[PDB]
Amino acid sequence: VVVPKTRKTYCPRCDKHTPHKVSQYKKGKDSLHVQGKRRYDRKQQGFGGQTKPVFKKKAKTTKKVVLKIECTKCKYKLQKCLKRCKHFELGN
RNA sequence: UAAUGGCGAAUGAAAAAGAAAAAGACCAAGUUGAUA
RNA sequence: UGGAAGUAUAAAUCGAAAAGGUGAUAGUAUUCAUCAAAGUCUAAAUAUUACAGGAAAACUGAUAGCAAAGAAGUACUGUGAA
RNA sequence: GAAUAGCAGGAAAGCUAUAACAUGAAGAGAAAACGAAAAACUAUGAGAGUGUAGAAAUACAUUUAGCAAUAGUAUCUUUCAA
RNA sequence: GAUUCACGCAGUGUUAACGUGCAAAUUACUUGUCAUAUUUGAGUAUAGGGGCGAAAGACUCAUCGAACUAUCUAGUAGCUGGUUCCACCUGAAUAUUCCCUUAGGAAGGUCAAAGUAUUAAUAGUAUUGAUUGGUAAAGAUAAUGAUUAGGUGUCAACAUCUUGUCAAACUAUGAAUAAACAAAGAAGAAUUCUCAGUGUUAAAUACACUUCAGGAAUUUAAAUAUAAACAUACUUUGAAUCGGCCAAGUCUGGUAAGCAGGACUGGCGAUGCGGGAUGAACCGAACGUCGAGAUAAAGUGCCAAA
RNA sequence: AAUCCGACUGUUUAAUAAAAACAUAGCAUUCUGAUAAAUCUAAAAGGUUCAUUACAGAAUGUGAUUUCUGCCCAGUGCUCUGAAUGUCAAGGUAAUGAAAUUUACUUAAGCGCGGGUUAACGGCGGGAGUAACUAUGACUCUCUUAAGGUAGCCAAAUGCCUC
RNA sequence: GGGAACGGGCUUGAUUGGAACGGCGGGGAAAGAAGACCCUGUUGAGCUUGACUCUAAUUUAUCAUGUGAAAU
RNA sequence: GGCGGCACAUCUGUUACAAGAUAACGCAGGUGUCCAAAGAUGAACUCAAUGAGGACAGAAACCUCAUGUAGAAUAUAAGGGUAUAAGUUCAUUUGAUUAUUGAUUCCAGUACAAUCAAUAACUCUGAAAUGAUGGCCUAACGAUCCCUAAGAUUUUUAAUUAGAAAGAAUUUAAAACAUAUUAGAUUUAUCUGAUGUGUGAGACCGUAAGGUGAUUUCUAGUUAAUCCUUUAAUAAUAAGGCUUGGGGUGUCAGAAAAGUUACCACAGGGAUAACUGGCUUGUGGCAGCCAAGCGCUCAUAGCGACGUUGCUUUUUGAUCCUUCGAUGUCGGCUCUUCCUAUCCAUUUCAAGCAGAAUUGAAAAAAGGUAUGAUUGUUCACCAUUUAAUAGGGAACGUGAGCUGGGU
RNA sequence: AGGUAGAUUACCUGACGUUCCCAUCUGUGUGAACAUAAUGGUACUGAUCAGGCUCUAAGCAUCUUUACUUCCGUGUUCGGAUGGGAACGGGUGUAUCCUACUUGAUAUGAACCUACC
RNA sequence: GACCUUAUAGCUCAGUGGAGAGCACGGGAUUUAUAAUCCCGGUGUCAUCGGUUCGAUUCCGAUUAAGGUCACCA
RNA sequence: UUAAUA
RNA sequence: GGAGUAUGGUCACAAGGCUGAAACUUAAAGGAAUUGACGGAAGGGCACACCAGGAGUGGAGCCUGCGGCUUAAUUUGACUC
RNA sequence: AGGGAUAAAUGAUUGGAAUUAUUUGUUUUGAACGAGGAAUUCCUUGUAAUAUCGAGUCAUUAACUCGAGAUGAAUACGUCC
C-alpha cells in the first residue's frame, strides 16, 4: 500500500544489517532471442492460423506487489512479495 | 536412446562396433599441334 | 526433418572466389582436424501376395477354403460407373 | 536359435561356433567434476544340548547359537538439499 | 396474351373407390383448362459446394436442406443388443479425493487368488479409575432476547417485589447413549551393588537422554471379567462396484405424498423356506441328499393338519 | 347483395399445401465509354452477356391504373470531385559495436478527422393543469429525441384486455 | 386383491360340453416403424452473423535494370 | 429442459443427532479486500453508561468526583478471545529478513495453501526475564509449458620465486614444413623442384652402495581465473541450465470458442417433460359440530359469524412409479352401462304451510330429462318448449366406429 | 502477632456498621539533586514532626453472592425390546440409566518458603 | 412470479458525505385596468423503517408505490 | 427592436 | 344571410369548371358625402414635457389621510391626472 | 458627545371632565438609521434649496395650510425623443 524507501534489513552477502533501497519490480522487456520465443515464431510460420492458445478469461483485477530491496553498499538485491493491493504507493 | 511435441497425445534417427559382398573407372578443364 | 537462433527441397530478390566446405547453439577472431561440391558410369551381397513352372503343410474339407471343386467373374440386376 | 559361419543327411528339423551386444554386477548430479567399511553396533527372534519329574505323550530348570524379518544406530559415495 | 365447346391435358372437390391396390400415386364422377408466356418428337448444351429453378429448398433416372458408385473402412462410439460345459469353495458395492465431471474415468474402501512370519502381532464386549463434550431435559429480573398482568415507592414514566407463557441461529446447570485412555512388552516384574558419555547446573553425587548406556547378584510368572492357534500380522497381484430401495418408540423442506433429502442399525438388491389368502423388504429363520423326533412365527367350525 | 387478398392472361412444392405464394407489365434506384461493368477458369494469344455500345450491358426493391409517397444522416452501411503529418507493414537510410544484434529517422493503402446519401439497413416520446352544471380539452406549463408515426386506415389474415 | 401403482396365467371366489359357420368391432395396453415430440451424447448436417482461426476474388507499397535529359 | 440462481473456489452461526464425519436450488449472512501502521516491543492509562456539581452552556460542547465484569473497543460477516489488556495514548523500530530441518490441518495421508516446533546468522524493543519469521483466531486464493527478475564471489585451481620430502621416466621401418642454400620461370596480390639443420624425437650413468634427473607433494608471498554448458581449444556478445519469486487460469487441480433449425439426422432414455393410471388433496366440489347474531317478539321455520371436524377425485396443482425398438393426443356424432351428492313423476314429515304458488328434509336410481342462433370449442350467453329440460364415472368411455372443425 | 514472595483463584467478592497497632505495614513532612508531569496529585528522591482517621488485618449480621450436603425425584429425559392398546396424534407395560431449577441445613477460608516480633 | 430502474417545493426535473432550476405563489413598481415587463421574497420531512455512519437526503438492507423486459417446447 | 385586450 | 352551399345533369386524369335551390334566420345590409374623434400618417408651432442639472421622494423612526383587519360602533363623501 | 423613538419616576398648565399619556418641565432609558432597489415628483433667478417668523384652526393642541422675510447654487437659451 504505502511503504517508505530506505529500509534497514539484513543483507546475506555482507552478513550484516545495512541500509537498503526499496523499489518496485516491473516485468522487463520481452526478448526476441529467448528459446521460447524462437519456438513460438517457428510454429506460427506457415498455414494453420493461431497454433497456440490465447488466454481470454481474465478474472483477477490486482497483482501481487514485489519490492526490489537493494543493498546500498553491496548492490545485493532481494525480492519481497506483498499481498494483493488495489492501490500501491511508495511513501516518503 | 539424443532429439522433436498445445514439451500434451504422440513422433523419432545416426557415428562408433559385429557380419553378407567387395571393384573401380571415366568426361569437362590443362597439354601435343605441317593439327584429323 | 529427430535436426532444436534452420536438416533437406523449391520459389522471389541478391549473388562469390589469387578458391573453399564441414566440426549440428547464433556472432567475430586466432589456432587445430578432415575433406576438395556445383558432370557421368559401375557388378556382388538386397526386395517380390503381378504372372508362369514346381515342392512342401500340426491350413479348410462343399454355409468351410479364393467370389468361383460343373460352360465362375458364369447366371442375373442397372442407362452407366459398377 | 544377433546377424552370420560350419557339420553329418539328401534336413524350413538337429548339432556346433571364447563373440558384437542386451540386462546385471554402483550409485547419486541439470552439468562440470565425482564415485561407497568402524573386516560394523543394539533389540527380539530360528536351532542344539544336559538334568528332574509327570509318568503315555509331555511339562519345568539350566548351558549355547543367535540366520531370515522388522526397527534403531555409528561409518562411507554423490547432491544446494538424503 | 377477349368469352366458350370439342380432340386432348391437369388434378379443385367427393377429404368417393383402392389402400397386403389395376397402380411403390392409379380409377369414377365433379371441376378447371383446352394456340402464341400454347402443346409436343428428335438432336443438342449445362454435372456434384456443381447444374437447372415464373422460387416449392423444387428437379438433377422411384435416391436431394447436397445424386449415384467404389476406395480410405472392419471409420469412431463414455450408448443399445448378444457373449456357448458340469460340479465344488470363497464372495461384494452406492463412503472419501480429483476430472469439460453428472449414462463415464483414476486414487481409495469392500472382495478373491497366490505367497509368507513363531508372532512388542487379538477385541464393533463388559467392569474399575482419571477425563472430554453441551444433545434431551431445565431456566426465564441467572446473562442476550420474547411476552400477560398484579402490588409498593417517587397520569404516565422510572425503580423495586411477585405472577403467566416461550427461543434452531439464548444460556447458568446438564443427563442416557457415546469418544479417547490405563489396568505391567527394548520384548513377564522387582530389589541391591557397581556404574560411564554428553548436557542442563553456581558446582553438582540432583536432573535429562543414552538397548530404564552398561556389568553382576538375589527374588520372581503377580497384577479385573469374557472370548481368541484352521488365532494373529500381513505382503503381492487383480476382479466387480460407487443409478440404489425399504423399515423405524428418528430428523429437515413441504398442506401432503407409495414426495425430496439426511444420522444409527438391520434388511431387499444377491434370498430361497414356514406364517400374514395374495406381496422385494413384515414375523420366525437363512438352504449339501434323506429318516425320526422335539420346536419358532402363528393357529385348532369346514376349505385346512390341530 | 356484400367483405378480404392478388390488378389481369400465366407458374408452382412429380407422390398430403394450387394459394393471398412466384411471374407480370408499370414505377424507382446503382455502376459502367468497352483495354469497361458483371462474371466462369488452376492457368491461358482462355470464356459468357457481346454478330453487343448508354433507347446498351450488368445489379436490385416494389408490383396494373387513380391519388400520394411525410420527418429523421445520430448508429451501421455506401461514397467523396476532399485533408494532413493522429495512428499504420515489409522495405529504405543512418549510428554504435569485432560482429550477429540493437537503436533512431522515413515510407502506401486502411482506420481516425470533415461532408453527402434513406424508392441504403432502418427509426419516427413522456408528465401535469385548464373552457360560466357534468364530460372532453381548442390553450398553456417542461422533461426530452437525429427525427418524435405525417396523409391516411383499423378490434383488419394486423387489437392482449376482448365475446 | 396384491404386484412395476390398468393380469390370460399368481391368491380368493363366480362359473365351464367337445368341434365350429355368418357377422362384429369391446379387448388382446392388436399389426405397421430401434418415437419424428422432450431430454442426455463432450454424435452430426443445412443456414446466419465483427463467434474463433483461416481462405479465393478485390486492393495498396517495394523488388524484378529500355534509352536521352532537367528540378528537388 | 429453458429463463432465474450459484448450493462450482470459499468463511461464521444453525439444520446436526453432547467424539469424528455429515444432505437438500435448507435458514440468517460473508470473501476476491484493507493496513509503514491497523506489524514488533516497552511504559502509562481504563472503557460504554449512570448519578451529582461548574458563567455563557440549554437534552447534546468542556471540566471534577463517585458507581461502573466490559453492557465499550478490537478494519470487515458471524461466532470465539481480551482489563496493571489483545482496548486508548506516548516512544523506539522494521523479524512483514536470510539458510536448514521435523511435524499438524484438507489429505489419496499427492500437489497448492495454511498451522506449528526447533536450529544457524544478522537485528529490533526492554533494566531484564522474555517477546518479534506480519495483522487476536476461524475466509481474503492458484499446476505443466512460456515470459520475466534475484542468487551462486566464504572456495578451488594453474603459473611463477623461497624452503623441504620422495621421484627411470620403455626400447630401433616417419611425414608436416618455420625456414636457410641452390637449379629453373615470372612480373603478378608471384610461383614451381631439390638440397639442409633443428623441430620431435623417447633406450639415464651403475656390478660400487647407488646417485643425478624429468614429473608430482607440502608450506610461505606474488599476479590471474573462478556456479555449470554451447560436445577440436579459447575469448567479449548471445543462448541454455540450477534454486527462489512475479505475470493465471473465478468453470478457482487450471480447453483458446456465437446462434438457429417449424427442412433437420443418428446412438440412446421411461435415469427425463407433454396423455391415462397410482399416492397426496393445497386448490375445486359436497357435508357436518358449537352458537355471536339476523329472522317485527323468537339463537336453531329458514340461515348461521368467530372457531372447528370430515368426505370426494367430476378442476388445477405436487411427484416422476409404469410406458421413448410408439398404449393414435380435443371436441362433436352413434351406443350401452354404472354412481347419487334427485331435476320430474310416486310415498311421507316440517314451515313465519289460510288457498294457490313455494321452501327445508326422509324412502327411493325401476322410468324420463328436449329443439335452436353464435363459437372447433368443453365452457358460456341468448330464443323457445316441457312434468323436468339434474350433476357425474367407465384409459379426461368410445378414431382397423365416423369426422378432421381445433391443436 | 506483622511484613515480603506466592499456590488455590469469591469459603477469598460487594454493601453496612466495628477492634487494636507494642513491633511491622500504611497513611505522614519536604522538594535539593536523579527523575516527573499542565499540576511534587501520580511516578521520583530526601526524611521522621505527629496518627490509628482511611488503608491492611481480625471479627458482626435470620445480609445479597459464592462453596459442600439433603430434598426436589427416581418425578423430566433416555439406552434396549412385541403380530402390546389408538383412525390419528401420540402415549403403556418389560429388563435399565437417571438430570436440572427451586427450597432447607452448614460454612465464609485452608495452606507453603524467608525475616522480625 | 423472476430480473432492472426510479421516488427531492404546489407541477415537471437537477444534485448531492458536512438541496439548484424552471413554472407556480405572495408583496412592491409600470398601465385607465388586466396581460406582458421590472424588483424582492417565501417555499423542499430529499417515499417510510433499520445499520455503516465523526456526520446520511446520498453508502448498505427492508417495506411500500411507479414503471420497463421475460413468462417458451409441448 | 418589441407595443395583445376592454 | 343561408349560398354559388345541397342535390340532380354534364365536362376534366385530378384540383375543379358550367347549371344551381330550399328549409330556416333577419330590420336592416349597403352607396356617395358632411362634422367631429382617432391614427405605432405627413407638415408647422408650444409646455420643466424632455434635454443639461439641482433638490428629492421610494429605504429608517415618527405625524397624518386612505384600504384592509377588528369591533357594540370603529359614522361618512371622494378612488388616474 | 451624530440620531432622539421607545419606555420609567416625578412638577405644572387648559378644562365641568385629561385614563386610551390634551400640552409641557425635570432625571434616567440610547432602538432602527452608514445616504436608501424597481420606480417616480417639483423647479429657469432674489427662482430652487436651506433654516426660521406671523396668521387660519385655537378653553388646550401643528410635523398641516396661507403668507413673510433671511442666505442665494448649478445648469439650457434648446428639441419634439
Q: Give chain B positions with protein CB within 7 A.
A: 5-7
Nucleotide nearest to A56 (CA to C1'): H256
Structure-determination technique: cryo-EM
CA distances from A21 to A41, A53, A71, A75, A85 (A): 39, 40, 7, 10, 21
In sequence order, the 6+-apart residues with CB closer than 8 A to the CB of A43 are: A51, A52
Quick one: chain A helix, strand, coil %, rounded to 5? Answer: 10, 30, 60
User: A38-63: buried (b, 16+ CB within 10 Å) or exposed (e) per residue?
Assistant: eeeeeeeeeeeeeeeeeeeeeeeeee
Distances (CA, A) of A70 to A1, A3, A33, A34, A51: 19, 15, 28, 27, 41
Resolution of the experimental model, in Å, one decimal? 3.0
